[PDB]
Short mmCIF file of C-alpha atoms and ligand atoms in Angstrom, two decimals:
data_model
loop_
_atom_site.label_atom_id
_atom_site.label_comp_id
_atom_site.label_asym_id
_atom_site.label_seq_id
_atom_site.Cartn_x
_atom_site.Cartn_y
_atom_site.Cartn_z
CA UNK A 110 232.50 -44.79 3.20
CA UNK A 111 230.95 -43.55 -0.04
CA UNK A 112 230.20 -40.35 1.56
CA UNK A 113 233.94 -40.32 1.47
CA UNK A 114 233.97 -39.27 -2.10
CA UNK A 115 233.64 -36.06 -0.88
CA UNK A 116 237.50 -36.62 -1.14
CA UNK A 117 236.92 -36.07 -5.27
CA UNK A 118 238.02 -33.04 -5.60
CA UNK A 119 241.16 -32.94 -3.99
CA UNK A 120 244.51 -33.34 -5.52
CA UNK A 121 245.59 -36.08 -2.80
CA UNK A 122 244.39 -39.28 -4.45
CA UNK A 123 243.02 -39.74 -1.21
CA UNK A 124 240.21 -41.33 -3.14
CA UNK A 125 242.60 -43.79 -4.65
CA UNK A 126 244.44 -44.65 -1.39
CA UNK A 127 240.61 -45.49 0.52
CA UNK A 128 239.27 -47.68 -2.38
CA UNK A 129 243.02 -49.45 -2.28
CA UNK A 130 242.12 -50.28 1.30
CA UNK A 131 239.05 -51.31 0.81
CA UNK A 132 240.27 -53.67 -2.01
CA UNK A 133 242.83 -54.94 0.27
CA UNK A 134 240.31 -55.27 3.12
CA UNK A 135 237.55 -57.61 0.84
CA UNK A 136 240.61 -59.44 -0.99
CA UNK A 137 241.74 -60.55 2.53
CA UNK A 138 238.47 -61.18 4.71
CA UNK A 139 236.29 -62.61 0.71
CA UNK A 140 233.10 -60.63 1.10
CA UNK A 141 232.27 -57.16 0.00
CA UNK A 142 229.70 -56.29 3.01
CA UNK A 143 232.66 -54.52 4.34
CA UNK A 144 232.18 -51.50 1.81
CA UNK A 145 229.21 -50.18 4.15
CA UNK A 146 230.57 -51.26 7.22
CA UNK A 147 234.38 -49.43 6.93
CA UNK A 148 233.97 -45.99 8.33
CA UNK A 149 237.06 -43.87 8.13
CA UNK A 150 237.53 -40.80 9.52
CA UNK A 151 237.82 -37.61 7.84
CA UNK A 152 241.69 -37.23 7.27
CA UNK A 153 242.23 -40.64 8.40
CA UNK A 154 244.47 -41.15 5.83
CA UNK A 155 245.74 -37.97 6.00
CA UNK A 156 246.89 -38.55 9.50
CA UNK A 157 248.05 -41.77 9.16
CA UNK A 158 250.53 -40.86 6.26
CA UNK A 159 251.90 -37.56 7.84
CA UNK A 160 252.22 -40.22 10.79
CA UNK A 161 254.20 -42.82 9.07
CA UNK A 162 256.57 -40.65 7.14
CA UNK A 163 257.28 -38.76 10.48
CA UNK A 164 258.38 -42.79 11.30
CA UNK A 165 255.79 -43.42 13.97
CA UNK A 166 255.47 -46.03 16.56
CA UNK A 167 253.09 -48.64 15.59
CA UNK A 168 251.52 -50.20 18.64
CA UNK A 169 249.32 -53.82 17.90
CA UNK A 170 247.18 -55.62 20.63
CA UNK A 171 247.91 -59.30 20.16
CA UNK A 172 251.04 -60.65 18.62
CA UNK A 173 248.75 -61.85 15.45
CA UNK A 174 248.31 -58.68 14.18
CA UNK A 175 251.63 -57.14 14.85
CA UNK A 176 253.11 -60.61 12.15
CA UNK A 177 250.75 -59.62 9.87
CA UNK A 178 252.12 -55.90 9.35
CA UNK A 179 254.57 -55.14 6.26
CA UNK A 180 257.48 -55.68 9.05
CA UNK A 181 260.23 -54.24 6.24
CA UNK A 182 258.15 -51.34 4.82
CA UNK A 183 257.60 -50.03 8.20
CA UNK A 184 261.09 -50.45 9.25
CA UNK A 185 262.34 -48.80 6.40
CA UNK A 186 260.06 -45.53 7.26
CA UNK A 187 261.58 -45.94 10.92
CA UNK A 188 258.69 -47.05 12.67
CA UNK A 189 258.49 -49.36 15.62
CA UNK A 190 256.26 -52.46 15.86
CA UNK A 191 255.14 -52.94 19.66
CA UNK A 192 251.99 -55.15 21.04
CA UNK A 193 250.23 -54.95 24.47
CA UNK A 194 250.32 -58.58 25.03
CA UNK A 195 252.37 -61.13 23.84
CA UNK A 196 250.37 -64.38 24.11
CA UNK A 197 251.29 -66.03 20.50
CA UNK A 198 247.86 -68.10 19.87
CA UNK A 199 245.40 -65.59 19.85
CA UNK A 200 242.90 -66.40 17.36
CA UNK A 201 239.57 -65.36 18.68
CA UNK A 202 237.34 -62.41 20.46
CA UNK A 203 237.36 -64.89 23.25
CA UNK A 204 241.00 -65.85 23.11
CA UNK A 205 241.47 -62.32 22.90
CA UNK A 206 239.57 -61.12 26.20
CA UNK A 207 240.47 -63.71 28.31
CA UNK A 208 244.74 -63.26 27.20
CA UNK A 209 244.04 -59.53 28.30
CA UNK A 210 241.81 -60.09 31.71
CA UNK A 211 244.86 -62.68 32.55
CA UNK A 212 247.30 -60.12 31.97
CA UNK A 213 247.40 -57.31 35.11
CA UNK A 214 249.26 -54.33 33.77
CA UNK A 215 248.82 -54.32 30.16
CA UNK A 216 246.65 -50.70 30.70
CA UNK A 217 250.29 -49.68 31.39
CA UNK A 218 251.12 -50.78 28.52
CA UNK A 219 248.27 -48.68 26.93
CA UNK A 220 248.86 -45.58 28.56
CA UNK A 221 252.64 -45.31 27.40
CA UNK A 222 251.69 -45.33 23.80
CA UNK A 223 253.63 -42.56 22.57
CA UNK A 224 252.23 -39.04 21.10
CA UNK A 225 251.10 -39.66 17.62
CA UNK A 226 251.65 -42.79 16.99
CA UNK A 227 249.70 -45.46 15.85
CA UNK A 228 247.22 -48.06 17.82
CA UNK A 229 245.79 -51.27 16.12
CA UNK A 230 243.23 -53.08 17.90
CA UNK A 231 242.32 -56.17 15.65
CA UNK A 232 240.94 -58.72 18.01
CA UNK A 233 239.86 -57.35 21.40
CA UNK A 234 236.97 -55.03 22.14
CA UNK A 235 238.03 -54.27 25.63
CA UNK A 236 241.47 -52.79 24.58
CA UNK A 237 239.57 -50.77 22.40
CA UNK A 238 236.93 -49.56 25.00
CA UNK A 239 239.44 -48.82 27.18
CA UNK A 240 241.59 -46.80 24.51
CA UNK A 241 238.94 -44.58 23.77
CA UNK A 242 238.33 -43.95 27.92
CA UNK A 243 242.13 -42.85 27.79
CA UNK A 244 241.95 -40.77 24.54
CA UNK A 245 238.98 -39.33 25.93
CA UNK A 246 240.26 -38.74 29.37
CA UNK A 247 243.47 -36.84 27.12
CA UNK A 248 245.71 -39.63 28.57
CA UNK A 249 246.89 -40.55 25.27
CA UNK A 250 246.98 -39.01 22.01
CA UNK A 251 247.88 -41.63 18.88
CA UNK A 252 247.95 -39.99 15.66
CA UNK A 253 245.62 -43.30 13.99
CA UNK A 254 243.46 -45.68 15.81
CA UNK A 255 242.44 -48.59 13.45
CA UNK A 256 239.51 -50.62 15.63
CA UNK A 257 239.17 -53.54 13.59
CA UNK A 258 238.01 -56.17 16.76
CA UNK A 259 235.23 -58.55 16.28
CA UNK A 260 231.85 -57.44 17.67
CA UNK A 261 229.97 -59.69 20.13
CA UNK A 262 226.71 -60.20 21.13
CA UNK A 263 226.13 -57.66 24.58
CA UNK A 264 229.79 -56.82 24.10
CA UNK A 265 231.51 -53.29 24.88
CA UNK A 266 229.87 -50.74 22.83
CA UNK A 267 233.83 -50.42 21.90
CA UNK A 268 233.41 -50.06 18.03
CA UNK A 269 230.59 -47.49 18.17
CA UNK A 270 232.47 -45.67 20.85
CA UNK A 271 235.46 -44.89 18.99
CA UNK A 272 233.73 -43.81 15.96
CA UNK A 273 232.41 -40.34 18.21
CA UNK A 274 235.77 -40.01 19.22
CA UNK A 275 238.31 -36.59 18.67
CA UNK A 276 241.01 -39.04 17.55
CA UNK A 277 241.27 -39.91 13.47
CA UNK A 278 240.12 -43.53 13.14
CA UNK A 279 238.82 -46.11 11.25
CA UNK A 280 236.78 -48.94 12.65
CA UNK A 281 234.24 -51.73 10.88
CA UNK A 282 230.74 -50.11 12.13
CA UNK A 283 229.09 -53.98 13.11
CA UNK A 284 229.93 -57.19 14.38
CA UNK A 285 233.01 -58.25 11.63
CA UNK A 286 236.56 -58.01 13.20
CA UNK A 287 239.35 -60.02 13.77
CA UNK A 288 241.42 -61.91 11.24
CA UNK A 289 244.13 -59.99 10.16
CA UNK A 290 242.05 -56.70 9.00
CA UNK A 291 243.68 -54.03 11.08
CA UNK A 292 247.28 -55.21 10.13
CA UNK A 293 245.47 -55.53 6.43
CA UNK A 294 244.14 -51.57 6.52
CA UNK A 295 247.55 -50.26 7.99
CA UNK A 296 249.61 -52.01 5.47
CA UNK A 297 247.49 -50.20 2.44
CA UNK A 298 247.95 -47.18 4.27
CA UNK A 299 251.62 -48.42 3.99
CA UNK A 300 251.82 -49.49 0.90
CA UNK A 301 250.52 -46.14 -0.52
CA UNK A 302 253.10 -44.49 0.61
CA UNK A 303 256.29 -46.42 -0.25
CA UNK B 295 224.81 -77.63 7.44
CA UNK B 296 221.43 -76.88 8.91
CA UNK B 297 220.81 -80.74 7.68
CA UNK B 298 224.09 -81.77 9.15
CA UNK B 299 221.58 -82.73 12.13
CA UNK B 300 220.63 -86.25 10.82
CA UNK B 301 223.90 -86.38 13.82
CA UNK B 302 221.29 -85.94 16.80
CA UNK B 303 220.40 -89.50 16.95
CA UNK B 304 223.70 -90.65 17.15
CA UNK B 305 225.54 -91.22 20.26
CA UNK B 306 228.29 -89.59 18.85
CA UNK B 307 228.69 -85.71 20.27
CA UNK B 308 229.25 -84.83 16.81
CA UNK B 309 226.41 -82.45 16.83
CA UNK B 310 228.00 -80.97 19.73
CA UNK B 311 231.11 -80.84 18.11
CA UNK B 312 229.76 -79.06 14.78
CA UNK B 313 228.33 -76.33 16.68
CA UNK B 314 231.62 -75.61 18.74
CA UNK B 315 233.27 -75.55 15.27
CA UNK B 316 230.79 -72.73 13.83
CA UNK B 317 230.87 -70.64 17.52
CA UNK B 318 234.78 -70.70 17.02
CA UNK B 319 234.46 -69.68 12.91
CA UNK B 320 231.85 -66.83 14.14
CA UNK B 321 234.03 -65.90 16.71
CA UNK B 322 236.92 -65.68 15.17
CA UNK B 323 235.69 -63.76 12.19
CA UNK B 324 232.36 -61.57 13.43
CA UNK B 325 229.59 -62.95 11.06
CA UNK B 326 226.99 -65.51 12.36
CA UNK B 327 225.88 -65.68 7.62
CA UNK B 328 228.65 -68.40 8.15
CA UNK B 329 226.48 -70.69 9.32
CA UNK B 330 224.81 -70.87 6.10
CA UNK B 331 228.13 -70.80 4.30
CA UNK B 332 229.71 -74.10 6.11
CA UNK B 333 229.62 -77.21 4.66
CA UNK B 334 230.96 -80.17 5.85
CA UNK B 335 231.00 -83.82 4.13
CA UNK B 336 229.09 -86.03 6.54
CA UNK B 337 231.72 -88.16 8.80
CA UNK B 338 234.22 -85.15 8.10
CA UNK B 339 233.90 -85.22 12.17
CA UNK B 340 234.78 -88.61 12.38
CA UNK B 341 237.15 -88.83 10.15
CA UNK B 342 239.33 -86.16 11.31
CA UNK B 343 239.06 -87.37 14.85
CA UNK B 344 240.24 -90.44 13.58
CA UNK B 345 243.22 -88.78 11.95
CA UNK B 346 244.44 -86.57 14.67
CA UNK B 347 243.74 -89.34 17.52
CA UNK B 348 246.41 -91.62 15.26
CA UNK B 349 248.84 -88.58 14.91
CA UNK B 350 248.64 -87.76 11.45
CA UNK B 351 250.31 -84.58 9.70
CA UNK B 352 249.19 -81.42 9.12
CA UNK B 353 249.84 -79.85 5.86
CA UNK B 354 248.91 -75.85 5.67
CA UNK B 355 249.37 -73.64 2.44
CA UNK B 356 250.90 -70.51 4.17
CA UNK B 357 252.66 -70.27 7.44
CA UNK B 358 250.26 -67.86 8.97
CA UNK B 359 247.71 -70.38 8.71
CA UNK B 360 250.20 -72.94 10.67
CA UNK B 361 251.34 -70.67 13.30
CA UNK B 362 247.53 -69.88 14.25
CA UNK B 363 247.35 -73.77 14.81
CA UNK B 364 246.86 -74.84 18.24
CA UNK B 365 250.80 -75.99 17.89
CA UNK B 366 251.06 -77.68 21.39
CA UNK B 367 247.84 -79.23 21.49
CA UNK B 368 248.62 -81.04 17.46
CA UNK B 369 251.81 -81.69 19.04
CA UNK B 370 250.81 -84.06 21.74
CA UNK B 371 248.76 -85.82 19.67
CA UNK B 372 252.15 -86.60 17.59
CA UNK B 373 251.10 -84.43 14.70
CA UNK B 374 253.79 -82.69 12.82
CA UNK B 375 253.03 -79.38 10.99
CA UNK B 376 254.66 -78.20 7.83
CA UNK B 377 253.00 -75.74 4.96
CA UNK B 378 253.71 -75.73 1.29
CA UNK B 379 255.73 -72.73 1.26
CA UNK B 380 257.33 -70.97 3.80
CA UNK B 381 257.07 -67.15 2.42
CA UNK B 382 256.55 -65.24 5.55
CA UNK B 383 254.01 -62.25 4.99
CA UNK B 384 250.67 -63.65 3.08
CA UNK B 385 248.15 -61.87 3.75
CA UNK B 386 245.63 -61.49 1.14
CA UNK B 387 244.40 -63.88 -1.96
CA UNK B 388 246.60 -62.19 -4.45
CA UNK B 389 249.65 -62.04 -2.22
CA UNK B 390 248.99 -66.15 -1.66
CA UNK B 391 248.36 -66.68 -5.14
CA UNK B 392 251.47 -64.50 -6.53
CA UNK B 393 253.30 -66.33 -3.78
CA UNK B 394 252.49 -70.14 -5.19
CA UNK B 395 253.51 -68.57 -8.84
CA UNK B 396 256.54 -67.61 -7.66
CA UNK B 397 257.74 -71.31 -6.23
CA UNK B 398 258.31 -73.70 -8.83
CA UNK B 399 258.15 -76.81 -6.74
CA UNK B 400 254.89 -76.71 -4.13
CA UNK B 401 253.00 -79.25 -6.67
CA UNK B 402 255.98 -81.88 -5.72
CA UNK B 403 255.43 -81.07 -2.25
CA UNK B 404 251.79 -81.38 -2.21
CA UNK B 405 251.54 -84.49 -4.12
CA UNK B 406 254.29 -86.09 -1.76
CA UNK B 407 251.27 -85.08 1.71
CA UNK B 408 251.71 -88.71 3.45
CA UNK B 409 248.50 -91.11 3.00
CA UNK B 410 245.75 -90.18 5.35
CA UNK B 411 246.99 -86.72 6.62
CA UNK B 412 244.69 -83.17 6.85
CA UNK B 413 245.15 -80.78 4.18
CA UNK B 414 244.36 -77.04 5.13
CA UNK B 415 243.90 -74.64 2.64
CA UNK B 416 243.27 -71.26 4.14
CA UNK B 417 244.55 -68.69 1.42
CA UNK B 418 245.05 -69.89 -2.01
CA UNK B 419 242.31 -71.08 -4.42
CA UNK B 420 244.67 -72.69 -6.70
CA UNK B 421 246.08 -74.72 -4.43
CA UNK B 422 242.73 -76.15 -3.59
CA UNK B 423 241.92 -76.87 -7.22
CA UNK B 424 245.38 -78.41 -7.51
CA UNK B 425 244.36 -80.53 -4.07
CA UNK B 426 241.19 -81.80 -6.42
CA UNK B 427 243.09 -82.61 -9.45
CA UNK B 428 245.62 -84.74 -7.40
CA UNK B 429 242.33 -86.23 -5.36
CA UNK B 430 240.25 -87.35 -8.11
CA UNK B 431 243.30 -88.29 -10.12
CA UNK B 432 243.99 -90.89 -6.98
CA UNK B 433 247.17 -89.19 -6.37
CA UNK B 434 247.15 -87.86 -3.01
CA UNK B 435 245.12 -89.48 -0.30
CA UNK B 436 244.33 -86.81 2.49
CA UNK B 437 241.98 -87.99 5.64
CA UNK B 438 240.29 -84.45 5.28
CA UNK B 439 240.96 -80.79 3.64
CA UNK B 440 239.53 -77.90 5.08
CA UNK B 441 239.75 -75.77 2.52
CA UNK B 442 238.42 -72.08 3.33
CA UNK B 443 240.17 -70.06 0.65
CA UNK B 444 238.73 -66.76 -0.52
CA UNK B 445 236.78 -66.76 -3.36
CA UNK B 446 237.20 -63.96 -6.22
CA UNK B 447 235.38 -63.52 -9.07
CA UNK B 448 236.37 -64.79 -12.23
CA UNK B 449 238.43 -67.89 -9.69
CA UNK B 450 238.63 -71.26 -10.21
CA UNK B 451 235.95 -73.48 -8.78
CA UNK B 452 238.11 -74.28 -6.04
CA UNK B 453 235.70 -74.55 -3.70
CA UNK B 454 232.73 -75.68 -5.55
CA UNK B 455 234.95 -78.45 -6.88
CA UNK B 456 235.63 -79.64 -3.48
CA UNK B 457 232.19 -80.26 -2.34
CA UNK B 458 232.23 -82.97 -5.76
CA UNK B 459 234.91 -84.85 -4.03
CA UNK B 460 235.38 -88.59 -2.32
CA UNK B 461 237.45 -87.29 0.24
CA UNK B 462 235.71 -85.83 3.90
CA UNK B 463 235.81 -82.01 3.67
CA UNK B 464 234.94 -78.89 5.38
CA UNK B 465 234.37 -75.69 3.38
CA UNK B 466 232.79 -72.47 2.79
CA UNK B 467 230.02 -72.36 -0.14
CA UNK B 468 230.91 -69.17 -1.47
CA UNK B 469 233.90 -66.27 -1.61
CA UNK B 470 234.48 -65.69 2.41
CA UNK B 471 237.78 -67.05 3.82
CA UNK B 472 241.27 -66.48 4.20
CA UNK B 473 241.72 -64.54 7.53
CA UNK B 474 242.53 -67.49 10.64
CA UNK B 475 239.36 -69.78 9.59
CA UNK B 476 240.83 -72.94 8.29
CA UNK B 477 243.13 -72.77 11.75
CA UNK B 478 240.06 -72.23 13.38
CA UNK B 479 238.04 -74.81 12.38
CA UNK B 480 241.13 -77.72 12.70
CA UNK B 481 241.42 -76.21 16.15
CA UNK B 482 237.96 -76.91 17.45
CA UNK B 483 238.57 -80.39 15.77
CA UNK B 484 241.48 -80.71 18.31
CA UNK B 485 239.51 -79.38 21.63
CA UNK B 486 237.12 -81.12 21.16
CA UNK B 487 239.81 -84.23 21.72
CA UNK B 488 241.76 -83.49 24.22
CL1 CL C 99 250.33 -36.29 1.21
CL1 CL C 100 251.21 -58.35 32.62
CL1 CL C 101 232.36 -44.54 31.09
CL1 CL C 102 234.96 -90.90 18.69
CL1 CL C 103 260.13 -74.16 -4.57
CL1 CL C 104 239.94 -79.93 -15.19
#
């Protein structure tokens, strides 16, 4: 996070678009904790932009998040807006695990994410545990993963997982999740660009 | 709060049903310092299980927090939903409060809420102050307001004015909110119903 302003001396405003998201991030969720916990990998942002203006698929968990992206911006750059599930009323970790152990085939879905694009996991850990297995495994290769799920008590180590990962990504290290953060980070990183 | 157990010798379950409403807010949103944070006016239980069991409406301030409402659940209960404006994509305290500056005519729609109907007021702290004004001035007459705004600094004492109020309330001391909270927190109202 603040070791991130290594970024200073760059030319990108990199530095700009990271506190933007952070801003965006505490003016959505109302508490500033989240300035330690975000953890962004190095040329997240990088990768997310190049990403975008190639007009990348965008690929959501639950339907929540997916309604909470800039729909327009994102259409405008070209990019699709897909979710693994569609259960509408997902509004909790535990709505959240239980809508994907009732559904049978959404690793399917998971698998098909296209090359570079972009994977948003804002409420479910186990999506996000099993996205890593994949990335790791070289099954998939999105050009972003934002792991934004809530963290539970004896829960997958999903969160920590991903932040070891090859992949660019950027993840809340702790328990806070959920909400609409993911869709809140991706649309700075959209905003930023348009 | 922690005090909010003067309910134990009661008869009543609404012990029970105060903790399912802070495991829903922590699970929904990934921080247990909630617990601290919620306050809620004593008989705010009863009185919203009085409302909903008559059928009462629902008025939300955004339509994300509406569509995160247990929808078919409210509905056989005979509760209708509406929100005070209908701009799709809020997602943040200053787009919510840029969106209420933008409509000219939410205060008519707010002081028309019908006599002993819940207010929810997940996103915009002016709104809530507004809510007050109309309250004290005996001009609306809600059965109960969650109001869970976020709090910014330099905001109006939104929240800390609702805690002074006559009317049963459930709120956040302090800045955390937006995010799905105030649909939380009605929805654990309504399980714990049905
Ligand atoms: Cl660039
Ligand atoms: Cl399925
Ligand atoms: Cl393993
Ligand atoms: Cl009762
Ligand atoms: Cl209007
Ligand atoms: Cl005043």
């Amino acid at each position: 996070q603040e070791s991130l302003k290594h970024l200073l001396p760059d030319l990108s405003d990199y530095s700009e678009i990271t506190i933007h998201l952070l801003h965006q991030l505490v003016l959505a969720c109302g508490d500033v904790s989240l300035v330690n916990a975000v953890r962004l990998s190095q040329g997240a942002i990088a990768s997310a932009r190049d990403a975008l203006k190639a007009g990348c698929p965008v690929v959501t968990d639950v339907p929540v998040v997916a309604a909470a992206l800039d729909q327009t911006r994102l259409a405008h750059l070209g990019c699709t807006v897909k979710t693994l599930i569609d259960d509408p009323h997902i509004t909790t970790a535990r709505e959240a695990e239980q809508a994907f152990w009732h559904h049978d085939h959404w690793q399917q879905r998971l698998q098909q994410i296209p090359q570079g694009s972009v994977l948003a996991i804002g409420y479910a850990p186990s999506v996000l545990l099993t996205a890593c297995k994949l990335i790791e495994q070289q099954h998939i290769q999105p050009a972003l993963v934002i792991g934004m799920p809530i963290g539970f008590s004896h829960a997958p180590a999903a969160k920590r997982r991903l932040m070891t990962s090859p992949i660019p990504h950027i993840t809340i290290q702790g328990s806070l999740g959920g909400g609409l953060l993911a869709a809140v980070a991706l649309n700075a990183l959209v905003e930023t660009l348009i």
